[PDB]
Design a protein around this ligand. Sequence first.
Ligand code: HEM
Ligand code: HEM
Ligand code: HEM
Ligand code: HEM
Lengths: 146, 146, 141, 141
Amino acid sequence: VHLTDAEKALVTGLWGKVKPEEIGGEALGRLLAVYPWTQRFFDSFGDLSSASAIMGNAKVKAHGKKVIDSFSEGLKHLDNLKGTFASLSELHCDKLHVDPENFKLLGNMIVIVMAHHLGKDFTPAAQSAYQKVVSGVATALAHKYH
Amino acid sequence: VHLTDAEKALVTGLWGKVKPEEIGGEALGRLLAVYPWTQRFFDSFGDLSSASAIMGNAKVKAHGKKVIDSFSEGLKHLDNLKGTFASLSELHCDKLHVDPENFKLLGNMIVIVMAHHLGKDFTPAAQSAYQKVVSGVATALAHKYH
Amino acid sequence: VLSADDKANIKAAWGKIGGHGAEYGAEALERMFCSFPTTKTYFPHFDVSHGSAQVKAHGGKVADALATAAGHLDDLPAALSALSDLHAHKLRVDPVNFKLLSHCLLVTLAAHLPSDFTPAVHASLDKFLASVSTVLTSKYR
Amino acid sequence: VLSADDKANIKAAWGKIGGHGAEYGAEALERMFCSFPTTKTYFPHFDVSHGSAQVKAHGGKVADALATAAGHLDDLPAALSALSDLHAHKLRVDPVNFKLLSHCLLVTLAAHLPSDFTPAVHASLDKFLASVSTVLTSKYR
Ligand code: HEM
Ligand code: HEM
Ligand code: HEM
Ligand code: HEM
């Protein structure tokens, strides 16, 4: 949502320094391992019975890529995350029944995974910009909940 | 935010059946008693050392009225809670440093106080409409946080 | 932890509930489904219309568990151990939902017991339900 | 509760932190102030600029408390009892802020210990910090 032009540059600059597929696979996998109730939604994914199984699971990795490709498209529309995620908001609410609190948790995993990959380059200022982004994505995903 | 015209009527109808000053004094007082860390913001209010002291405190009751008068004005602008609470969002963030999670907690107290006063008239459908209202007020109050 | 006064308030409140436990549990559930529709998928076989039989029966199970807990304020982890396994390992209930049901039970009690639901009693009951929810979510690991 | 594997992961991780505890605590605090500016008012005397001395000193106090806790995984309420009084009764810290600082410490560890911060270790450390925060917020009453 409201990031300055400079803040947007900070975000998009660092995004070009990571490999999105890795960020997505690892963020989703950490979500499943750190908050195991989230596994309730992924019964079709097969073996999620340990962190090793989760990180070795092809379906988790593939789904992580779809999640992160949608995140990447969000980064190109920071001034309209509500519009950008409207269809996905409907999907998560009407079809999947995911409580919106979990959007915040996955956002937090994306933040932690970015720090894991970027190290000291993920400064306190960079983290603050990314928290604003994931907060906005979570708000947008929760918008069509009814 | 998005309430149908009928949902708005349900909300405003029941609002005309309570005494706002009572709702405000009691919601704020319950906030202070149920979640005591919130008292960190009200050192100037004097004795908040027990539920009895809180409910007997003139400043709490007076402040409860200001809070509820702002809530009442929000009920007249349900299609623009963001604009309606923009100045108060700035106040709570920049001057008061209240974490936005607490807006949700006070909203919950307003809901419980409405049930306390209205009894069976506060139906599951009425509660759902009011949850949408307080969720929207909390979102609006958090909007200008930076 | 729960103070002596908390325990007094919880005992007093649950005495006032008495035979209406199942009614209030059913209503708490109905309120949760209405305000927070995501919760309905935990009970796919339920008719969740006002006054339905399966809702009333399940409300009774919840009420029974809470009554037993109210007589076990000093050993909740032991008393709620079997239910903690069921909700975490089997049902995999999202922890947010315990907060949702607790809020709806408090709404239900306020709506039914206005003379008894004082601010002090409300504060004690909020702690009681939060303590119960804590045990019920303790075992994701 | 913390499993045997959790305890193993927490011990391994804190061994890897070793002498850098104060640095990481200071950074966790800086990250919290930057991402969540509401938290700054808890420390009105602080210069919160990058590398400030009071932040480093307080980071060291937090690090010391966490190191002691990591050697007390089976008696956290007893070990953190004095700090629970300070944070609830005196500082009246909003419980949300413990989640904020815990997240920032995890960010800090991921940024500094990439080889060691595996998903399994992350899950264990999240439980450790949540367990510590629980004790620190246990005493509002
Ligand atoms: C940053 C937050 C999130 C984003 C951007 C996101 C994005 C997506 C996308 C792009 C899809 C694919 C839809 C399609 O291909 O048609 C999807 C599906 C799905 N999402 Fe999410 N999601 C998020 C959070 C969550 C969370 C927190 C959960 C559960 C805890 C969740 C559960 C699911 C499930 C179960 C599916 C269906 C997967 C399948 O059947 O293949 N999502 N999401
Ligand atoms: C529904 C949510 C809320 C509404 C509608 C609201 C509204 C208001 C209003 C109208 C004022 C008066 C400003 C003025 O007179 O210039 C105010 C001040 C204040 N608010 Fe809130 N507020 C809400 C939530 C909270 C929460 C959750 C807290 C703290 C936990 C809080 C703490 C304060 C404080 C400390 C003041 C200054 C009081 C004084 O010095 O007299 N507010 N708020
Ligand atoms: C105060 C908190 C709670 C208490 C005391 C409680 C108690 C119980 C009890 C005693 C049972 C056993 C039912 C039986 O044997 O027939 C049960 C089952 C169940 N609970 Fe809970 N529960 C609580 C919170 C929740 C929440 C928040 C959810 C989900 C939103 C939930 C979902 C379920 C489901 C899906 C079942 C299985 C129902 C069936 O198969 O008939 N519970 N609960
Ligand atoms: C892992 C969680 C935490 C730990 C282990 C911890 C530990 C400590 C310790 C050991 C002290 C004593 C400092 C001294 O004696 O000089 C302290 C003080 C303090 N803590 Fe915490 N704390 C935690 C979370 C928080 C949070 C989330 C906040 C607020 C956002 C906070 C605010 C404060 C403040 C304001 C002081 C007094 C500082 C001073 O006067 O120098 N703490 N903490």
